[PDB]
Amino acid sequence: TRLLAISPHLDDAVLSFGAGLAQAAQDGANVLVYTVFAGAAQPPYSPAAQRMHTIWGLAPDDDAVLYRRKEDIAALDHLRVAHRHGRFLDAIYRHDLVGEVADDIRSIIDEFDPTLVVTCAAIGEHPDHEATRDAALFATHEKNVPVRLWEDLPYAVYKGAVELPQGFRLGSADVSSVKPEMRSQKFQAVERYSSQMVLLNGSENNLFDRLDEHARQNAPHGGYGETTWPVVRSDDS
Ligand SMILES: [Co+2]
Numbered sequence: 001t002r003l004l005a006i007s008p009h010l011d012d013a014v015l016s017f018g019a020g021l022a023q024a025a026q027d028g029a030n031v032l033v034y035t036v037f038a039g040a041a042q043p044p045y046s047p048a049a050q051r052m053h054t055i056w057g058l059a060p061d062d063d064a065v066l067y068r069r070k071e072d073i074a075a076l077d078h079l080r081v082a083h084r085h086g087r088f089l090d091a092i093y094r095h096d097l098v099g100e101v102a103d104d105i106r107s108i109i110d111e112f113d114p115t116l117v118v119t120c121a122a123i124g125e126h127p128d129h130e131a132t133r134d135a136a137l138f139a140t141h142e143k144n145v146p147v148r149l150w151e152d153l154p155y156a157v158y159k160g161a162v163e164l165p166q167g168f169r170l171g172s173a174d175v176s177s178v179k180p181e182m183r184s185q186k187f188q189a190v191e192r193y194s195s196q197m198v199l200l201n202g203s204e205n206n207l208f209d210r211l212d213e214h215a216r217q218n219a220p221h222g223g224y225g226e227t228t229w230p231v232v233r234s235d236d237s
Contacts, residue, residue, distance in 0.1 A: 001029035004114035005081075006105065008132040009037050009090060010068040011193045012120060014075050015200075017150040018186035019178040020118070020226050022079040031081040032112055035072060036101055036132045038085035041065050041093040049092045056195035065090070068195055075192035079185065084108070091128050101135035109143045117147045118228065121162050124155035134165055137231065141168075151227035154200065154207065157214045167237035170229040175218045183224035187211075 003024050007013035013021065013033050025031045043061045045053070050060035058064055069085055076083045086104060088097070109117075119136040122129035129152060140147045149170065151160070164170070178186070187208050191197065200207045212224065219225025 001027070001116065002112060002114045003029045003031045004108065004112055004117045005031065005033045006117060006119040006132060006136045007033055007035040008120060008122075008126070008128040010035055010065075010072040010085075011075075011190075011196045012129070012152065013150075014072075014079070014186070014189050014193070016120065016153045017118060017226055017228070018075075018079055018189050019182050019224065020150070020176060020228070021076075021081050022185050022189075023176075023178070023182055025080045032084060032114075033072075033076055033081055034084040034086060034105075034108055036086045036104075036135070037088045037090045037128050038065065038069060038072070039087045039089045039093075041089055046092070052092055055198055057198070058195070064195070068193075071193045071195060075189040078189040078192060091126075098131050098135045098138070101131055102139045105135055105139035106143060109139060109145060114145055117145050118150060119147065120152050121149040121156075121229065123152040123160060123162055125162075126155075137165060137168055147231045148228045149231060153214070153226075154210060156227075157210050164231075167234055168231055169234045171232055173218075173227050173229055175215075175220065175227050176225045177220040178215075178224040178226065180224070183212075186224075 005013045005021060021031055053060050053062055053064045073083055117136060117140050120129050120133050122133045215224045216222045
């Protein structure tokens with residue numbers, strides 16, 4: 001198996017699908033996590049971006065992208081999977097965009113030759129998540145590579161139906177069964193994203209409790225698991 005995961009930001013793949021990535025690697029798959037919006041940024045930053053940087057524990061004008069890339073390498077190394085950091089700027093530093101992302105994805109498909117691509121459903125409708133998903137759908141459709149979408153975490157813990165580009169639809173939900181030790185490995189990887197843990201934990205300091213409770217609702221035997229859907233072509237498309 002050659003598994004190409006396509007993450008919008010530096011954290012999403014691990015948050016949403018870290019157990020699936022680590023179990024695929026343990027099973028013997030060749031796993032590569034490409035993050036689209038890992039592009040380098042520099043001052044001048046917007047006041048909103050400066051605000052994010054300070055929340056994350058950096059100076060307002062620090063190189064937050066480099067710090068986050070190092071978090072991602074640490075997290076993905078803990079899952080024993082490879083990384084690839086793309087050129088696109090996170091929405092806080094910003095069809096044209098989607099086309100460029102799709103072009104880069106097609107190049108990566110040619111180089112890595114995945115047997116399966118997994119990316120986000122873009123539950124929560126974040127523009128970068130939608131751009132990532134849509135670009136991945138277009139590139140994989142053109143290259144005839146199968147695709148699955150993961151349930152975006154923690155965004156789906158509260159809110160599930162998404163509008164895909166015309167021609168694509170989802171099959172039935174699959175909820176994986178993840179062993180307690182692999183749950184722990186995932187959560188340990190999530191913790192490597194120190195910058196993001198600030199807001200992910202929130203005032204109740206409860207990210208992992210929330211993720212556990214969400215999974216317990218639908219996963220086999222009330223254990224841990226991750227929801228994904230296969231993508232197929234709609235009729236008349
Ligand atoms: Co994200």
